[PDB]
Amino acid sequence: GEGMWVPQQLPEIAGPLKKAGLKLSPQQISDLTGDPMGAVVALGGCTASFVSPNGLVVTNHHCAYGAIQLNSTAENNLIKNGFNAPTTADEVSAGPNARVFVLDEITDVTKDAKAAIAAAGDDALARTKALEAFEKKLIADCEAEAGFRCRLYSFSGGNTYRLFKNLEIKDVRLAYAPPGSVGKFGGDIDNWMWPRHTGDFAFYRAYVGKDGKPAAFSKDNVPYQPKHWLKFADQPLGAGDFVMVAGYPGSTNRYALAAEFDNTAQWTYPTIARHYKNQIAMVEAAGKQNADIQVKYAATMAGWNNTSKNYDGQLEGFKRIDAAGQKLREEAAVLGWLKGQGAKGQPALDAHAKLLDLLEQSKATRDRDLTLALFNNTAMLGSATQLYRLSIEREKPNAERESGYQERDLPAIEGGLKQLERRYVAAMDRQLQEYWLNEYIKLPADQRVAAVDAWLGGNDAAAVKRALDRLAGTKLGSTEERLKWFAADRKAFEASNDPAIQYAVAVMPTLLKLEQERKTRAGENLAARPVYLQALADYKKSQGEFVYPDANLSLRITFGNVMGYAPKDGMEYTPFTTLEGVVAKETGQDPFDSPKALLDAVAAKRYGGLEDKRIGSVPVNYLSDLDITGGNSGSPVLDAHGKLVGLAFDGNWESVSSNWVFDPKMTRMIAVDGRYLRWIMQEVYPAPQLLKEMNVG
Amino acid sequence: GEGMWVPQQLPEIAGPLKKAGLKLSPQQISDLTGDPMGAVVALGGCTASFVSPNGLVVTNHHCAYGAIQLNSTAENNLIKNGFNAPTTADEVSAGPNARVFVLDEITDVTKDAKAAIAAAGDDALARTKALEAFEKKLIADCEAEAGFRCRLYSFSGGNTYRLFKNLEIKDVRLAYAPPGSVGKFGGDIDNWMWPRHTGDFAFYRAYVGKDGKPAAFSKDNVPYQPKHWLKFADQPLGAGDFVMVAGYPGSTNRYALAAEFDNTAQWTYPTIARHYKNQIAMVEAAGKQNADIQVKYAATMAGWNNTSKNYDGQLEGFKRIDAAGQKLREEAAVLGWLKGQGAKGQPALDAHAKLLDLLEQSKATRDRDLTLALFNNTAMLGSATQLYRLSIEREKPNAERESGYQERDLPAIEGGLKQLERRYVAAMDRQLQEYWLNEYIKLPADQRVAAVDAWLGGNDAAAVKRALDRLAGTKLGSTEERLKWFAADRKAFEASNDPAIQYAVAVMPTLLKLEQERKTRAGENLAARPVYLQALADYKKSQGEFVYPDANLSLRITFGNVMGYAPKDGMEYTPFTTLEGVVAKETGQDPFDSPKALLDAVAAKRYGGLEDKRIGSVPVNYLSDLDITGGNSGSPVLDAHGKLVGLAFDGNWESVSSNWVFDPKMTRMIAVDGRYLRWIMQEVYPAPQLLKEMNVG
């Protein structure tokens, strides 16, 4: 059922957990470095878990797609073929930026954090800088232990702060991916849909130095030995059974002003979707010509497809449940409520007023802000602005450098410049720069950027064309030139005749000023958000409704039971799909082109000891009423005894609007059954070595 | 489950009926003139049943559609608005050709029929004429009692013959029809489909003379007093519960040569579907501009839509089950098995070869034969040919007149010529004449008809237009002119300058020659069909398959249980639909434009005392695994205690290929729940008088 519960809410959900079927004690789940919860790890925008005492980590194929794509060429396509390492020496690096984070400690630091914030008094910008300075000092102290990375999380609008501390494993290697026709069966046609038939799984292995401490990739590193790992279930999962997920959902917007919603529905989601589709169309074409462009842009392409379909689905789900309607009506009812109680509820009513005007403000410039952001996110302009900004920050003491530009951020910066080699083709990026310039010129005169106007030389196909021809002369296209500039000083940037770098030097003043304009808006928000959101929460508690914070990339628990749903009268989706359903979709064309070994094994009812009698086949995917969102991919699904029953990977089409307005009747998690993992690894693309290491063959 | 069982098979289904849940004794079902079976009546192409002692008859809306349409005008459109007679004097005539047939007696005449055929000797045309004379004499004797109509049925390819005697009620009046947006909710979009939300019911009343005997319409007639009628269930029908249907299915082709299937799938269904769709397009387009065409062609257009969509569904179903492959392998098995039996199999083998050759003779002229038939079925050429044929037959003694043109057929002929007034617009029929002329001209040289070629006197768009201008001069467009010709003698036809009459006179020799050919082939079939189909039956029995005859418009029993079906992996259709499903489909545009009182009542949760707590609403339609087809529409669905729980009206999309190859997993009946009949008549389009008369008031 509903809720992305923080581990500190476990007493609130103890009884609900038992009633839904948990047969572990709430005590045992509370131990976030215990069995099983100490097996659950964060990847950075996906979840995973350890499944052997030798560092084996399972997550989704689409979570590992980055890594598989980084290791793929046109002439050896791991995406298409799969990857299997018969020994640990065979495992290939997942990339310099790949991580496994292993939870170490959580601490409330709320009291201190709002003290620091208050200590700056009445100046919006100073309030932001004081929180920034508080966070940096905290993190600096927490990361003083070698091998740990820490993070500060603000919950419920800034009513609570916690500090998380993680072991940072920095050598992650690919051990197994099934072929892409299993890992992503049904492609973007089945994405966000049920019935689903997707084998969305892949395995990493986690490595440290010989001293047992984190290290970056080296051939002398050896497998991490986790304190805790998951065991596969020995009881078959069936309809109605208890399941639970722990993981790292990224963001929700369930506490929001109606105007935040209207803006998102009417503007943000339609605009982003349109832009995303336009770039897909461009890249799709060029890649039909050019297998190098196709393999190199595959990850970016999957991203654009996934987000644009999600927003299409959110827009549809709003209309289905009248979300505009509900938001209006709960806002009226909460505003009603507040004046309602006169003296006491006046702080909250003021907050509402502030927040709302802050939001008209961000609204005045939103087209400018998006367009410039995405224009600067193309490859060579991104690289030049990031690298120039780093040269600016390096002049300050580390403690004062912008987050993202401190010493602690250097590994990831340098890592990104090397990963970009596998994701960049100049003829392709030129077309994207063109696309974004065209949209820039499009902007109204009041919505323009001085420095960009001037850099460009006026508003037409001709100038666009000059820009593109000039930028084409950058040397930032090679990894070596990027890594040269990664180490160069600010003066060398200001001296450069590289046209990409000249663009950066030209606009950076504007970008820093707009960053100040954002830090100022956030500071005002920081006063007004926690009060108002605390009232939203208070009203909900007064309606007996469930109260938990919007997702914020921290660890959450969700629980429920295996069940389907009913999209329309006269029909129901069943909780499971089956092997026969995979083969019924077969067309021999992508994305419905399963391996021959699967097709033959299914036509033979070779079920490998994995059949579930109740469904008369091996289960493939399943639905449950858990409450998950982007960031939960790869999360282990555990049964009543804490055993592994599947991996979370998607939501059904009608679920995605629950980011804004939760609908219990149509919100389901889609998970890959652990018996399908097993079956694929026995009969289709075998990994007898991983099965044995997981004590299942 | 499977089976359109003849009443004489009750001994064989007694056990299975009881296992499925029947609580009436089987001998109580054996009494075909008793309770409740004596309540079930034939309408001639639909089924109905009595539901009051005062002659009230319930059937489907689509069955009464002809009669509602005949009482409809552009200005006062009962299809649109519904009809409700607050007292029995307000009932309107359903039309001169409307009938209710009440089973009186069934006689086996197999032995006498087969002796009549054998007496004819070797000659195929004499064999047909001998069976015709046999039938006519039998029927004349059986119809010696005033007010009775009799019918001879051939079963299992001519292995059994039975005669049915029915009381023939000839004054049928419309008593109630819901608005068309209930009676045909979802229109052709939801036709042949589940989920289904259609209140497909209407009521007639049956009338006789004051002396108790059948009579054509008169104000002096009074309601018929049936010996038996149905009662509404007092127990709520639920999933899994026993249901049975008795009715009059028209035809199936489950005993067929593989070549008969091949020709149907490859030529018959595509060809007819195309032709019906071409004509639908013309009539639709014209009716958009002319509300008189729209109302006058509505019943015609409902037939073309229903059949062409049925045919599309069969072709898709044949692919889903590989019906071609299944027919091929069964016939290879049966022929194997026959060869198997040396000498004693040889007559079935020779019968097979003959039936295959006769299929080839048919095929050689199939284009000509279909095209000429459907050309001559437009309104004026149909009337001219029918009436001219009648004038020829009238010069023979009655016993020798072609079936359809005997004295006993005169009331139906005359009634057709009157009904046509409400179904004909010259400017529409002209366009249909034009369509069939352009199809005729596409035929190749060996498929043309000399008499039509001469009449046409050219082969181009110009000749087509001159022919249409000539035909538009007919005076048969008026009812009075048609009835003049109904009485006129042959020389009067041959003297006429009416251009439609002249066409009829010109082509009649050719139609008579073609009829002789079909009689000759039928007479060859008479010899071969019973031997091969007996072999087919014996083969099925040796495989332990169900053995029951193909439908042939006679009374059948089917039974089973309420249950949905699974159309694909990950999905199930539930056995019921509900009121909230009707409203979920509402668009305010035909065909999804429910009466406002329905939309209000559902919004207000006015369930009228009819809610089934197990589904949380009033049920609308339901699925069951009964075995029905065309002609079963309007059949009552009875529960375990023989009480009325709904009406049969349709089958699901995947079912329709069961006409050729029975598929148990996806063959379901769609029925309208009796509770939805009641609910409409309470909350939406009220008829308290009829509810009272059925004591559910």
Ligand SMILES: [Zn+2]
């Ligand atoms: Zn247990």
Ligand SMILES: [Zn+2]
């Ligand atoms: Zn250089």
Ligand SMILES: [Zn+2]
């Ligand atoms: Zn006349």
Ligand SMILES: [Zn+2]
């Ligand atoms: Zn009972």
